[PDB]
Amino acid sequence: XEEEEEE
Amino acid sequence: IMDSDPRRCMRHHYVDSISHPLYKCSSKMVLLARCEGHCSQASRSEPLVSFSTVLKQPFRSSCHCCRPQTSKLKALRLRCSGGMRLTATYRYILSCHCEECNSGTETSQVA
Amino acid sequence: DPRRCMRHHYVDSISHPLYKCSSKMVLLARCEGHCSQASRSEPLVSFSTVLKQPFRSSCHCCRPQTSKLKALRLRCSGGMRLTATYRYILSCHCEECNS
């Protein structure tokens, strides 16, 4: 530094 | 191609209904995001060696925590009894990451 | 589970920051592991137009629960014996990040 950015 | 560990730090969506805890306002459903997971780096704590007075802090430590990396400020508008409008503020998390425990995010603006 | 919060031993070489002193290698305990409780962070909602505390979070860290204060004397140039202090970790546990 552990992957989500929402249509 | 390997899917990764599902228990790692990642973002989750959830819905909640916002109401004021005091005013008679019209409640409102909102989509929110949160962060949760088990960060991969182990957390550590080592003793520090002092020759001076016994240390106020005897350890050096590292610990990673699943936290918002990026987010977006959003406002919500509630309609309340007297026709008075009440605005609710929150942050919509866009992405999540693993970061150190003791690290933080300042709100105070600088001149 | 070998990945959990527990005590790990390692050698550290004690040296004075400044004085020419006869170095001392000692066996120290560190606490290291993966805490079982997931870490998380949540948005807080404010009815103010200001958001000073945007999030509510929880995180567990592998940390010393019990420790002995130990003194060590270093043989140093000029016949001096200088004294160092450190905490010998005895037990470690998984604890909330910001107490």
Residue numbers in the entry:
A (entry chain H): 1 to 7
B (entry chain A): 31 to 141
C (entry chain B): 35 to 133
Lines quoted from the article behind this entry:
We determined three crystal structures of Norrin, using selenomethionine-labeled protein for phasing. The Norrin protein fold is identical to that of the previously reported MBP-Norrin crystal structure. Each Norrin monomer comprises three β-hairpins (β1-β2, β3-β4 and β5-β6), a β7 strand at the C-terminus, and four intramolecular disulphide bonds. The two monomers assemble as an elongated, head-to-tail, dimer stabilized by three intermolecular disulphide bridges (Cys93-Cys95, Cys95-Cys93, and Cys131-Cys131), in agreement with small-angle X-ray scattering (SAXS) measurements which showed Norrin dimer in solution. The dimer interface is further stabilized by extensive hydrogen bonds and hydrophobic interactions. Superposition of all molecules in the asymmetric units from our three crystal forms with the MBP-Norrin structure showed an average root-mean-square (r.m.s.) deviation of 1.5 Å over 190 equivalent Cα atoms. On inspection the superpositions revealed a high degree of conformational plasticity in the β1-β2, β3-β4 and β5-β6 loops. The flexibility inherent in these regions is consistent with the relatively high crystallographic B factor values. Conversely, the structural comparisons underscore the conserved nature of the interface at the dimer core.
Norrie Disease Protein (NDP) gene encodes Norrin, a secreted cystine-knot like growth factor, distinct from the lipid-modified Wnt. Unlike Wnts which have promiscuous interactions with Fz receptors, Norrin specifically binds to Fz4CRD, but not to the 14 other CRDs of Fz and secreted Frizzled-related protein (sFRP) family members. The Norrin mediated pathway maintains the blood-retina and blood-brain barriers and regulates angiogenesis in the cochlea and uterus as well as neuroprotective effects on retinal neurons.
